[PDB]
Amino acid sequence: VGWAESLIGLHLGKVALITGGSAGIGGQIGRLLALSGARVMLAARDRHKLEQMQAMIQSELAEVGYTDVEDRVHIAPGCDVSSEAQLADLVERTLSAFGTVDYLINNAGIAGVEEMVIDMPVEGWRHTLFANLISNYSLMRKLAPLMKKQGSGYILNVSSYFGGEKDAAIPAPNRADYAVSKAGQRAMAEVFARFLGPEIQINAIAPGPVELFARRARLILENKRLNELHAALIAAARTDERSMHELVELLLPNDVAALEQNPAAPTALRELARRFRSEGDPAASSSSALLNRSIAAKLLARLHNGGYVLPADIFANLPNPPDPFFTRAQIDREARKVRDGIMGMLYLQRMPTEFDVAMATVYYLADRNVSGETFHPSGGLRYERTPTGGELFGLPSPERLAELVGSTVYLIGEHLTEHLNLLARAYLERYGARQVVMIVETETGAETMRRLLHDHVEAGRLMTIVAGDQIEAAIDQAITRYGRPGPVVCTPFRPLPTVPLVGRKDSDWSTVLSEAEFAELCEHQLTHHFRVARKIALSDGASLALVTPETTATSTTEQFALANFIKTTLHAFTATIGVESERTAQRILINQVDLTRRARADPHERQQELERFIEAVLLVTAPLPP
Numbered sequence: 001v002g003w004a005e006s007l008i009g010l011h012l013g014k015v016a017l018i019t020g021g022s023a024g025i026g027g028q029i030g031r032l033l034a035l036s037g038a039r040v041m042l043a044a045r046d047r048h049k050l051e052q053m054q055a056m057i058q059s060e061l062a063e064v065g066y067t068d069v070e071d072r073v074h075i076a077p078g079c080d081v082s083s084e085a086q087l088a089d090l091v092e093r094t095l096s097a098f099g100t101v102d103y104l105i106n107n108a109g110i111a112g113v114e115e116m117v118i119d120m121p122v123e124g125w126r127h128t129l130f131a132n133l134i135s136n137y138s139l140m141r142k143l144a145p146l147m148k149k150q151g152s153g154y155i156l157n158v159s160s161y162f163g164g165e166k167d168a169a170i171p172a173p174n175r176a177d178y179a180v181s182k183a184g185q186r187a188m189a190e191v192f193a194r195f196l197g198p199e200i201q202i203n204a205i206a207p208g209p210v211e212l213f214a215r216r217a218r219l220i221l222e223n224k225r226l227n228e229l230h231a232a233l234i235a236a237a238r239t240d241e242r243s244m245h246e247l248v249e250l251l252l253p254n255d256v257a258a259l260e261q262n263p264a265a266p267t268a269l270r271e272l273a274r275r276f277r278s279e280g281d282p283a284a285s286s287s288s289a290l291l292n293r294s295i296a297a298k299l300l301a302r303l304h305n306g307g308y309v310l311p312a313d314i315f316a317n318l319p320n321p322p323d324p325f326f327t328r329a330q331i332d333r334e335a336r337k338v339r340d341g342i343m344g345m346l347y348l349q350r351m352p353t354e355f356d357v358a359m360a361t362v363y364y365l366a367d368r369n370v371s372g373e374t375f376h377p378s379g380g381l382r383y384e385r386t387p388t389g390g391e392l393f394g395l396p397s398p399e400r401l402a403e404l405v406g407s408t409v410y411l412i413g414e415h416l417t418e419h420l421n422l423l424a425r426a427y428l429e430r431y432g433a434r435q436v437v438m439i440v441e442t443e444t445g446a447e448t449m450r451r452l453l454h455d456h457v458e459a460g461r462l463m464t465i466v467a468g469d470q471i472e473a474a475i476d477q478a479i480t481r482y483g484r485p486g487p488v489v490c491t492p493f494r495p496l497p498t499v500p501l502v503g504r505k506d507s508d509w510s511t512v513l514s515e516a517e518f519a520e521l522c523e524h525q526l527t528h529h530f531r532v533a534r535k536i537a538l539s540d541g542a543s544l545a546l547v548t549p550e551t552t553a554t555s556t557t558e559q560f561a562l563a564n565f566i567k568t569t570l571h572a573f574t575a576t577i578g579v580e581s582e583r584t585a586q587r588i589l590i591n592q593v594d595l596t597r598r599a600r601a602d603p604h605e606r607q608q609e610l611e612r613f614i615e616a617v618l619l620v621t622a623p624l625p626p
């Protein structure tokens with residue numbers, strides 16, 4: 001009798017580790033697993049919140065008739081999952097308390113940087129990947145050996161609808177780091193299942209929206225002001241002789257009315273001011289002041305990152321608009337717009353509670369016959385998605401191909417020398433590009449490409465730059481010395497690793513892909529492209545192709561799995577920055593080109609494989625006529 005009845009015995013005899021276990025979905029999964037008879041370890045940062053969650057669950061267990069409830073619910077406070085050292089301590093603490101872990105519930109997540117890519121610090125991106133994605137691999141790598149040795153285990157990654165679907169990506173503007181980490185959580189389950197079977201199940205859950213929008217609305221309105229100011233300054237500079245520095249000085253009085261009426265100001269800035277007044281709330285200082293110090297700092301960074309020369313202290317004396325910069329009426333209005341938009345996307349016109357999602361998840365965990373899947377414990381969304389892995393294709397139109405004549409091409413890479421050689425020669429010999437800038441990682445890479453392209457090096461058509469781990473500064477060098485690019489083709493510097501992804505039942509797994517190697521994989525195959533895109537998305541007229549890693553007939557099955565992991569995970573990034581790029585005055589296109597095809601299965605077939613690559617890249621880097 002009672003709603004927990006459905007649960008008694010459901011997970012009896014299991015030991016579960018739940019990260020982010022002090023609140024939200026994770027706390028409810030921990031609660032319901034304990035009611036179902038599992039011993040649970042709840043991991044989180046704040047001791048107090050985790051203590052009160054422990055006390056609530058233990059009280060509920062005793063209420064249902066469990067005895068010795070202290071033995072059934074343990075906590076691991078101070079656990080920052082972005083710290084590899086603290087993940088090691090968590091596993092030690094959990095094994096000492098309970099012995100082998102049966103269920104790894106990878107639930108901890110941080111929201112991330114919550115900015116557009118062009119405003120997203122590289123270290124904040126990396127931190128989100130460590131907290132939300134690399135942490136899931138790390139705990140799997142520590143717990144799967146014991147699971148396989150005992151003959152059973154279960155890894156559940158708590159992804160999100162923001163991570164997309166198996167064969168379709170979803171844009172998540174202002175959340176690219178988060179969306180990438182969510183897509184990676186799903187892709188990890190999709191590609192590791194064949195290696196972790198038969199002993200270990202690995203699945204993801206991807207709930208849709210779950211039960212304030214005010215902070216989110218806040219961010220949207222501040223973002224809007226930043227984007228509108230940036231876009232107006234870029235537009236004004238196209239038809240005004242003054243330097244960007246001189247144009248930004250027009251903003252320093254921080255006075256909407258004075259700017260609208262300044263006959264020395266470019267019309268784009270006067271029209272912007274007229275817009276802020278006409279569309280604003282009279283009680284909001286954003287209707288009478290152009291910006292605040294927070295928005296001003298982000299604007300200055302965009303301009304610097306786009307190559308504009310301005311003093312670091314240009315906004316040091318900017319007058320500070322009085323609170324509220326946006327009124328609660330403005331914030332609540334945008335919040336209701338966000339809410340109503342999500343409610344409108346749900347087929348069922350209701351969102352689940354955290355309890356509902358956890359209950360469905362805890363029933364799902366009892367199913368012993370599924371692996372490699374993403375379960376949707378809530379779902380039914382009208383969001384548009386972008387199918388991934390469409391194959392058949394050809395050359396672009398002759399009108400678009402002719403537009404490459406005289407263009408400046410950037411190629412980035414090092415490992416894929418045959419791809420880089422053929423692409424450079426296609427642009428230069430076949431389509432009359434003026435010059436190719438070859439941006440490599442090392443001097444040895446540079447010498448290799450200079451050797452392969454010696455004729456074009458001698459003729460001044462092929463320039464090489466050595467980027468090292470300073471790709472942003474290398475792009476700046478290319479822009480200053482050789483001019484802005486049209487095509488930019490971004491291939492990974494590094495090949496995929498050649499290591500096993502699982503160990504033998506009785507082995508120590510010492511040769512299996514390490515936690516540190518997994519982080520390096522993300523650095524070289526995801527963050528590499530993020531860093532290039534972050535810069536190129538400020539370069540007007542660029543067409544960026546992000547290229548994911550190769551697999552050949554000599555590539556291992558582990559490399560094929562890692563290539564598919566990267567493909568899926570990067571498609572979340574590509575879809576997101578595509579939408580974000582619509583908000584800047586700079587005209588940029590961003591597309592992804594996948595080298596590894598769907599199935600694993602002589603010098604002629606190779607050269608046609610490479611020729612389809614060339615055609616793919618041309619189809620997304622040739623500019624459409626204006």
Ligand SMILES: [Mg+2]
Nearest residue numbers: 237238240241
């Ligand atoms: Mg100008």
Ligand SMILES: [Mg+2]
Nearest residue numbers: 581586587588
């Ligand atoms: Mg654009």
